């Protein structure tokens, strides 16, 4: 086992590949504390299930097998080249490779990519996955009801022949290749589409297919005999089989992982506290551990619709009075609490910049003079009473640190815990819940659904992205027409450097509003057993790229 033999070294899989190999064979033994959310490629949102989807299904574009920056740029997979952009970023054309096959030996055609995209529109039958494609492809004057309610194709998606697909968007969208790399755009042939039941027998265009799924118990993958290695620039497809054990307690999982009973943790939520201690303090175990950024941001939102948070000076007071050390310590410091940040973008993104509008003093513990001055400006010099919304666990400990921080300047906060299961949907994520319970501050964590500035920031701050019926991620309900207009400009800007500059302007404007208080970029500790080959943290996921892995002989 790993505790008795040294590994590649601390962080060896962060920005590089550990134990490179082309050796095929063996069974990759994976573990997760949770079952998949779905085996329908359109109905998944879990990051680790998206990783699993790289074994099961190909897409037009896919993130390349690359530990460096280029891993963030979608590469041709089923398509012969990247999307060809015409009409100002409004029309995207792809050409499909010829002769490709599903696991049942039937052909992949452009009709199947159109069908997959159409399926997304059937939210009454196929909820659970990303819906970015809907506003880009739906005609508001002639709405598309999905492929079960009409057999007329979506008018914005053309298939001039079996190997060509054309997407006619409602507006420019610079990041369209990224949407083609999401699993909901993996082809689904209509002939095999059993709708609500698709996850029970999905077709596979990837190097593996589902052999057995027992809910809460196991998922076994075997090779897809019709996948063609010569046609796949992404996937080495090394193991003969992949076996996922499901449902273990998270500490039980760490223990058995470190003991060698499983090879890798697919779920990828990192070592829990006990194993984090064990692993980071033992010389041999550190050699088997990577500590990447996950690209998640932990932050507090302030909601102008909840008095007195409508006043920019109240919001700035909170920013100045935040004890950044105490808050990081609540989330795992002094040594394991993520990476301190004063701005929003993760350093994976081109726009990432120095921005600290509200510095918290030479010790980062709060500038209380600045905070009090802001409170005087708000006409509340002695403070005020407010409520912070959170959920039990780590979010609660962070809320407590906020309470303690702000008490120093007379802002008296009461904590309101919301239902854990629905926190992101019906709790923090519902504008009516937030108003009903007076949640002027909210504690949350956010990861982009694709590794770009738009994917990361638009859902958090774009006025058009306020979700009035739940699942809202623009928590302050910021609707600044200048912010919105800048975002629009990025979407039709072809030059990546001009785009970065525009996004720097958006971020600065968002911080001027002071509605988001960034706390840390999250970090995690992944453990890798030394006999696993090709282990690397995928910069697009913050998790190991499962599909690239093999087994040493």
């Amino acid at each position: 086992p790993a505790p008795t033999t040294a590994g590649a070294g601390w962080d060896a899989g962060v920005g590089a590949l550990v134990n490179p190999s082309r050796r095929r064979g063996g069974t990759l033994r994976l573990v997760s504390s949770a079952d998949v959310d779905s085996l329908d490629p359109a109905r998944t949102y879990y990051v680790w299930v998206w990783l699993l989807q790289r074994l099961l299904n190909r897409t037009l574009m896919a993130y390349p097998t690359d530990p460096g920056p280029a891993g963030l740029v979608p590469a041709p997979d089923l398509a012969e080249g990247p999307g060809e952009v015409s009409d100002g970023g409004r029309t995207w054309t792809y050409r499909l490779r010829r002769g490709l096959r599903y696991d049942d030996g039937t052909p992949i055609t452009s009709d199947d990519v159109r069908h997959a995209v159409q399926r997304v529109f059937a939210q009454d039958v196929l909820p659970g996955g990303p819906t970015y494609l809907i506003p880009l492809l739906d005609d508001p004057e002639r709405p598309y009801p999905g492929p079960y309610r009409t057999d007329e194709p979506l008018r914005s998606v053309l298939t001039p022949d079996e190997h060509t697909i054309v997407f006619r968007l409602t507006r420019p969208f610079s990041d369209f290749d990224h949407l083609m790399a999401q699993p909901c755009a993996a082809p689904v042939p209509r002939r095999s589409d059993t709708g609500a039941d698709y996850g029970r027998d999905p077709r596979s265009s990837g190097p593996y297919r589902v052999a057995r799924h027992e809910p809460d118990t196991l998922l076994h993958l075997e090779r897809n005999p019709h996948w063609d290695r010569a046609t796949d620039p992404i996937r080495p497809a090394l193991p003969d089989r992949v076996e996922l054990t499901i449902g273990l307690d998270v500490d039980v999982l760490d223990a058995r992982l470190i003991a060698g009973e499983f090879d890798i943790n697919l779920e990828g939520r990192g070592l829990q506290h006990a194993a984090q201690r064990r692993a980071t303090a033992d010389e041999v175990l550190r050699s088997h551990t990577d500590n990447p950024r996950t690209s998640f941001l932990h932050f507090v939102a302030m909601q102008p619709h909840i008095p007195p948070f409508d006043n920019v000076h109240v919001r700035r007071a909170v920013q100045y009075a935040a004890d950044k050390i105490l808050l990081q310590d609540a989330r795992g410091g002094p040594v394991n609490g993520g990476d301190l940040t004063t701005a929003l973008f993760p350093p994976t993104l081109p726009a990432h910049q120095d921005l600290d509008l509200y510095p918290t003093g030479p010790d980062l513990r709060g500038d209380l003079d600045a905070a009090r001055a802001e409170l005087a400006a708000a006409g509340l010099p002695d403070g005020f009473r407010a409520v912070i919304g959170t959920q039990r666990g780590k979010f609660r400990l962070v809320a407590d640190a906020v309470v303690e921080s702000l008490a120093r300047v007379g802002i008296e906060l009461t904590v309101k815990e919301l239902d854990v299961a629905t926190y992101f949907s019906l709790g923090a994520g519902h504008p009516e819940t937030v108003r009903e319970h007076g949640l002027g501050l909210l504690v949350t964590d956010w990861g982009a659904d694709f590794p770009t500035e738009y994917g990361f920031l638009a859902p958090l701050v774009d006025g058009r992205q306020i979700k009035r019926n739940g699942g809202n991620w623009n928590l302050p309900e910021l609707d600044d027409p200048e912010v919105n207009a800048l975002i629009d400009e990025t979407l039709h800007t072809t030059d990546p450097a001009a785009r970065a500059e525009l996004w720097r302007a958006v971020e600065r404007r968002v911080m001027e509003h002071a509605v988001l208080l960034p706390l840390v970029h999250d970090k995690t500790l992944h453990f890798r057993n030394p006999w696993v080959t090709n282990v690397y943290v995928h910069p697009a996921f913050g998790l190991y790229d499962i599909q690239a892995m093999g087994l040493a002989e």
Binding site: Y45, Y423, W446, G447
Partner: peptide, 6 residues
């Protein structure tokens, strides 16, 4: 997306 999660 939101993060993972006695």
């Amino acid at each position: 997306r939101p993060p993972g999660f006695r």
